[PDB]
Amino acid sequence: RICYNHLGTKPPTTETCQEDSCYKNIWTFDNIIRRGCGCFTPRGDMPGPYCCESDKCNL
């Protein structure tokens, strides 16, 4: 599937990745959208970003 791992300062790379789930992380520390193919933490307001099992999965 495709999930981006851009921003911080440098915005061009995207992870055309093989994992069963990917996450949208919109906080970090630096107030930014920097994220990836990983996750696998049930997001029942548990430690982690919001994690989904679809291509992009809402930008």
Q: What was the structure determination method?
A: NMR
Range of the domain at 40: 1-59
Looking at beta carbons, which pairs linking 34-37 to residues 24 or more positions away fall under 8 Å? 34/5, 34/6, 34/7, 34/8, 35/3, 35/4, 35/5, 36/3, 36/5, 37/1, 37/3
For the chain, the domain total comes to 1
20, 52 contact by CB (below 8 A): no
Pairing of β 22-24 and β 2-4: unpaired
Looking up tokens 């933490």, which residue turns up? 41
Length of the chain in terms of residues written: 59
Say which CATH number the domain at 27 has: 2.10.60.10
| Number of CB atoms found within 10 A of residue 33's CB | 15
39, 1 contact by CB (below 8 A): no
Gap between the Cα atoms of 3 and 23, Å rounded: 8
